[PDB]
RNA sequence: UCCUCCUAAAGAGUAACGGAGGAGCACGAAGGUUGGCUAAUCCUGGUCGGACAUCAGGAGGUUAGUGCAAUGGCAUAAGCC
RNA sequence: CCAGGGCUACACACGUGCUACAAUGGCGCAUACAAAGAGAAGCGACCUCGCGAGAGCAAGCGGACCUCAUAAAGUGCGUCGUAGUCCGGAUUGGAGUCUGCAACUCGACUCCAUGAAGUCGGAAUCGCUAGUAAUCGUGGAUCAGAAUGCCACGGUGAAUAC
């Protein structure tokens, strides 16, 4: 849905990803950015996405190839 | 020709020559296969007899059985039994002809089987086939009736086929050549 | 005659017949007829068997009906395996593209229930 | 008034404002004969068949059925065609 | 002062509009005009590729010169022949452009596929007396990008007021 000439990765997200794959397995850390593009090369992170008053963990799996990090965090609360 | 296939192949050369097994009366034999229809409480339909008598009288000139109830027990107000189905159990040469025409419609053209057709699982020896898709019709009008070959066709099978099943013959869906 | 369907597309035009087949619309039907060499103004009724065979090959060289339908089905199932916003709106029966649900969500909602 | 069981004591009979139920018909086939056949129920695969509609297989053996109450019957069937 | 989210929710109710329910019409080809406008942190013809939204140092213009800008209903055909349909496009799934650091919440589009309801709508109710109502296009404001709303301009152009 975005441009096919360039994906959008935050620099702070990229340095968190590089430090996390330097460390290896790691407990989830709270990330505030929902504007992100993931890749099959970096599938495996346990990074958590913030949506307002509650923070939810996200465990990415093999089938997501281009989705946002904010899609798995529900911003709205319904009954 | 499938009767000649059963008489000819898988039996007479190698197991007769090298390592003897006991009886061609002991090897499984295809008995009379059957087909049934399942219509509702309406009596006014003639379409059931039309399709079953068409599949019978494309070669023959006879009519199916109009079955009311084997059980003769009804949960409705009339316990006696309304005529609510058709039966054609296939017979000898015509049985082998119907089995061969079912194979030569379903098998050599990949049309019907999309995914894994086996979903309801239990063990004891039943193969009923309901296509729900009109596979063949003898008249020039291919599909004008309300029924879409929703009828069940019963084959009785000890579904194991162990020796040459798990050796070479599984089932699945890659048409190959020599 | 008929290729893989419930009702006869004949006594009509070839583009109308290849829209009545599932999974091919008007523009891809015109592409199928252009790659098969069959004119559009002729009728699919009273068509020769070889031209129907070339039309069958043209339909078969692209994605057929049923296979594209189950492809849509596992795409929606993969979205539900994600559990993302699109999968949640698919489960709730709410619109996915992002239009309003205060009024005028009645296509996704179906008939109005009090 | 009539029928069935128990009371009723292993022949018949046997009372009470004793304990339970039915009958005042039906059928020209639901009679006769000949020929044929065998249920209830349970477990499985398939078209709205869903727990129970119709097939096919297995278990079971009369747990069914008898035009209608109950009792005694009934496969050599008196049960079904 | 920030980073996210919400102002865009959704078992419902009402108001204003847009699209249609079709033959007065739908799809492919050809065809002659409009008026009013805006354009430099812009308008941007044209070269090239693509059955596409559209990708470069491309000229012209700060405006009777250049661009937006092919006007469309209509007129000639070929076809569809009164069907939930070559009517309508909602919704959904794939492959993308443009904008802006970044379109999941939460922009517009076109490339491909499906094609809900809809058969001219109850009680009730609204506008209009002539270039009017209807109907068909076009421009501007805010605007990084995003109008079916608003302002504004022209084409065809009624019926009836005893």
d(CA B135, CA B111): 9
Chains with 3 or more CB pairs under 8 A to chain A: C
**Which residues 64 to 123 of B reach strand D, CB within 7 A?**
67-75, 81, 84-85, 87, 89, 119-123
Q: Which residues in chain A have Cβ-Cβ distances shorter than 8 Å to C85?
A: 71, 74
CA-to-C1' distance for B81 and D68, Å? 21
SS3 state of residue B59: coil
Spatial CA neighbour of A47 closest among A74, A70, A77:
A70
* Maximum Cα interatomic distance, chain B, rounded to a whole number of Å: 65
SS3 state of residue B129: strand
Contact B142 C67 (CB under 8 A): no
Task: Pick C6's closest partner by Cβ from B111, B115, B143.
Answer: B143
Angular region, B31: left φ>0, alpha ψ -120 to 50, beta rest: beta
- CB proximity list for C62: less than 8 A, separation 6 or greater: C24, C28, C32
Sign, Cα dihedral of C34, C16, B114, C68: positive
Number of C-beta neighbours around residue C68 at 10 A: 14
Tokens of B50: 């039309």
Tokens of C109: 């909602």
Closest nucleotide to B151 by C1' from CA = D47
Please enumerate residues of C whose Cβ is less than 8 A from a Cβ of A: 78, 81-86, 88
| DSSP states along B3-54 | HHHHHHTTTSSHHHHTS----TTTS------EEEE---S-----HHHHHHHH
Burial B21-44 (b: 16+ CB within 10 A, else e): eeeeeeeeeeeebbbbbebeeeee
Determine contact, residues B50/B145, Cβ cutoff 8 Å.
Answer: yes
Q: Which residue is it, tokens 């990330």?
A: A31
Q: Which residues in chain C have Cβ-Cβ distances shorter than 8 Å to B111?
A: 4
For chains A and C, count residue pairs whose Cβ atoms are closer than 8 Å: 16
In three-state form (DSSP H/G/I as H, E/B as E, the rest C), the secondary structure along chain C is: CCCCCCCCCCCCEHHHHHHHCCCCCHHHHHHHHHHHCCCCCCECCCCCHHHHHHHHHHHHHCCCCCHHHHHHHHHHHHHHHHCCHHHHHHHHCCCCCCCCCCCCCHHHHCCCCC
CA-to-C1' distance for C42 and E156, Å? 38
In three-state form (DSSP H/G/I as H, E/B as E, the rest C), the secondary structure along chain A is: CCCCCCCCCCHHHHHHHHHHHHHCCCCCCEECCCCCCCCCCCCCCCCEEEECCEEECCCCCCCCCCCCCCCCCCCCCCC
Chains with 3 or more CB pairs under 8 A to chain B: C
In the DSSP assignment, the letter for residue B89 is E
- CB proximity list for C81: less than 8 A, separation 6 or greater: A61, A63, C87
d(CA A36, CA A68): 5
CA-to-C1' distance for C103 and E54, Å? 35
d(CA B36, CA C53): 35
Q: Do chains B and A touch (3 or more CB pairs under 8 A)?
A: no
Angular region, C38: left φ>0, alpha ψ -120 to 50, beta rest: beta
Contact A67 C78 (CB under 8 A): no
C22 contact to strand E (CB, 7 A limit): yes
Q: Which residues in chain A have Cβ-Cβ distances shorter than 8 Å to C95?
A: none
E strand residue ranges, B62-142: 65-67, 85-89, 127-129
Closest nucleotide to B75 by C1' from CA = D52
Residue with smallest Cα–C1' gap to E104: A71
CA-to-C1' distance for C63 and E77, Å? 37
Approach to solving: cryo-EM
- CB proximity list for B28: less than 8 A, separation 6 or greater: B158
Determine contact, residues B20/B12, Cβ cutoff 8 Å.
Answer: no
């Amino acid at each position: 849905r975005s441009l096919k000439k360039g994906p959008f990765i935050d620099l702070h997200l990229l340095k968190k990803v590089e430090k996390a794959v330097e460390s290896g397995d790691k407990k989830p850390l709270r990330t505030w950015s929902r504007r992100s593009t993931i890749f099959p090369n970096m599938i495996g992170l346990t990074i958590a996405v913030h949506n307002g008053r509650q923070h939810v963990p996200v465990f990415v799996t093999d089938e997501m190839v281009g989705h946002k990090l904010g899609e798995f965090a529900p911003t709205r609360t319904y009954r | 020709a499938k009767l000649h296939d059963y008489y000819k192949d898988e039996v007479v050369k190698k197991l007769m020559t090298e390592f003897n097994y006991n009886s061609v009366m002991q090897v499984p034999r295809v008995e009379k296969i059957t087909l049934n229809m399942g219509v509702g409480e309406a009596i006014a339909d003639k379409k059931l007899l039309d399709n079953a008598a068409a599949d019978l009288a494309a070669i023959s000139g006879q009519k199916p059985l109009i079955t009311k109830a084997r059980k003769s027990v009804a949960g409705f107000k009339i316990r006696q039994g309304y005529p609510i189905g058709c039966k054609v159990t296939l017979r000898g040469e015509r049985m082998w002809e119907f089995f061969e025409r079912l194979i030569t419609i379903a098998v050599p053209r990949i049309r019907d089987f999309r995914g894994l057709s086996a979903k309801s699982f239990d063990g004891r020896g039943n193969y009923s086939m309901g296509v729900r898709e009109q596979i063949i019709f003898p008249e020039i009008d291919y599909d004008k009736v309300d029924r879409v070959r929703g009828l069940d066709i019963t084959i009785t099978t000890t579904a194991k086929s162990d020796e040459e099943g798990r050796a070479l013959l599984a089932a699945f869906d890659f048409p190959f050549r020599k | 005659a008929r290729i893989a369907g419930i009702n006869i597309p004949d006594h009509k035009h070839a583009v109308i017949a290849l829209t009545s087949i599932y999974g091919v619309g008007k523009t891809r039907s015109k592409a199928i007829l252009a790659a098969a060499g069959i004119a559009e103004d002729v009728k699919i009724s009273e068509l020769s068997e070889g031209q129907i065979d070339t039309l069958r090959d043209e339909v078969a060289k692209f994605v057929v009906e049923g296979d594209l339908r189950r492809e849509i089905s596992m795409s929606i199932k993969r979205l539900m395996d994600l559990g993302c916003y699109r999968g949640l709106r698919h489960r709730r029966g709410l619109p996915v593209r992002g239009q309003r649900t205060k009024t005028n969500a009645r296509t996704r909602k179906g008939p109005r229930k009090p």
